[PDB]
Design a protein around this ligand. Sequence first.
Ligand code: HEM
Ligand code: HEM
Lengths: 253, 250
Amino acid sequence: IEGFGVGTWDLDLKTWALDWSDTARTLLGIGQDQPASYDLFLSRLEPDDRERVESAIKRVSERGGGFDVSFRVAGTSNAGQWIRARAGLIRDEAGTARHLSGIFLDIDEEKQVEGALRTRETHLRSILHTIPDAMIVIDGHGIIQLFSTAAERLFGWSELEAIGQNVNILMPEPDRSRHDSYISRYRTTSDPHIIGIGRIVTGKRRDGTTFPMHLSIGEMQSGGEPYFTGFVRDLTEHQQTQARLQELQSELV
Amino acid sequence: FGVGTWDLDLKTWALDWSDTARTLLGIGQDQPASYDLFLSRLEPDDRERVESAIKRVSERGGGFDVSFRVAGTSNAGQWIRARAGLIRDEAGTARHLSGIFLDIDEEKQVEGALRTRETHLRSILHTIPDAMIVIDGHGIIQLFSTAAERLFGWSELEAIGQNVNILMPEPDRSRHDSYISRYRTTSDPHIIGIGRIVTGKRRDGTTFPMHLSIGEMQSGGEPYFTGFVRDLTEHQQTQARLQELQSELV
Ligand code: HEM
Ligand code: HEM
């Protein structure tokens, strides 16, 4: 109760009387000496979560319940206090549903973690759509997990077509049949042949046509499994320009 | 229902918890509420760190939260955040300790997902062949790839926080902040979508032909742009060789 760090509160469906903790007063940004009031509790809230609050108290009134709703208050000028109000029902007897008691939780840090994840996901999508090189992400066994827009244009598969399939569908033989062992050999020996180095190889479209590409791989670890992020650059025009360079310099020579 | 409730009074060392509280702990529902039973659900290294925490809160004053996982239900553990405070019987005697049990399995999944995305962001930043740069709505560098460091000669910690205009010659340098500013109001892109060959400037002072590709995104009321920069210094080496060789024919 002293230094608890969590607010507590009470509200009765009949007589609408409310008593919150002193730790709860600070969370609402008001109440230095003034008394607890449910109308005052409304005043601190912004007028969207308001209607969701009485919708919640009407929902928990009906037969049963469970009460948890989240909101932000205007405590400070350029910041908001995010609070998750959680509560449970206690009936007097078999007769009616009397006062509902609960807690106020400070969920500033949880919402901060939320937004950070949301930003990272949004940004990952932008990287996938914008990157000029074809970006492919596989798991420890070569199973495509992400497939960039450039990769779609280059290999002729869509993201939904490619994600879940083995990365060896992108390459001709013998590399297609050997690519699983390439990954397994790397994982046991830790001796890289393309990671950090880079290699020009031949990639294969869904058409069946083949094209010269530069491959670059980087590794990561998540939940006990590695993931490999590949970057593919189409060298079909680069060696086409080299084919121009060598044959045009022949008629000079 | 709601979250679980419990109290462990320091006087008489008893402990009682609510009906939703015991389901969170994985209580067999025959067992009664005892403090030695609570410590039997926790895993060994968690156990001692919990018991380290109560010893640090044995000092009269304050509050107590710990997070842990019990694992006997689904092969993936149940995460609980146990938060508690003190009440005092008299002026100098602390008697009861009352608090709550919070299911936080969702809170730990978002943590892990964020961790994975952050790890993958670092992997891309190290590995992408083109220079990747990320700016906010005002042109301040927020992320700076390894390839960008090698191309522009600034370090990540040097570049981040600085305006992106330090990467380009004049007059683009002085005009770049207007370019972003006009784009934000008008929404008419000139490089977003299209892809422009421009000239960039290293910290050296030297310049080079680069290709710029920009992608937009929105987060927290501010746009962010991700620039992909490719050096064309060897591409135009071959283009100059092609131009000289086919001009020597005519
Ligand atoms: C699409 C055409 C591709 C071809 C032809 C190809 C070919 C190869 C070859 C030949 C090796 C082994 C080199 C050696 O042992 O001498 C290799 C290794 C490997 N590749 Fe692929 N690859 C392709 C795409 C990818 C992509 C897109 C990824 C990841 C997203 C990837 C992941 C790996 C990994 C993890 C290894 C083992 C690590 C290493 O040897 O450094 N490959 N690849
Ligand atoms: C380093 C050398 C760079 C140069 C020389 C350069 C040049 C330019 C120019 C000339 C424009 C205006 C186009 C016009 O009005 O016709 C522009 C716009 C823009 N640039 Fe830069 N840029 C550079 C780097 C970057 C990077 C790395 C990013 C992103 C991280 C970026 C973000 C933007 C944005 C958001 C716009 C406005 C939207 C648009 O017009 O597409 N710039 N840039």
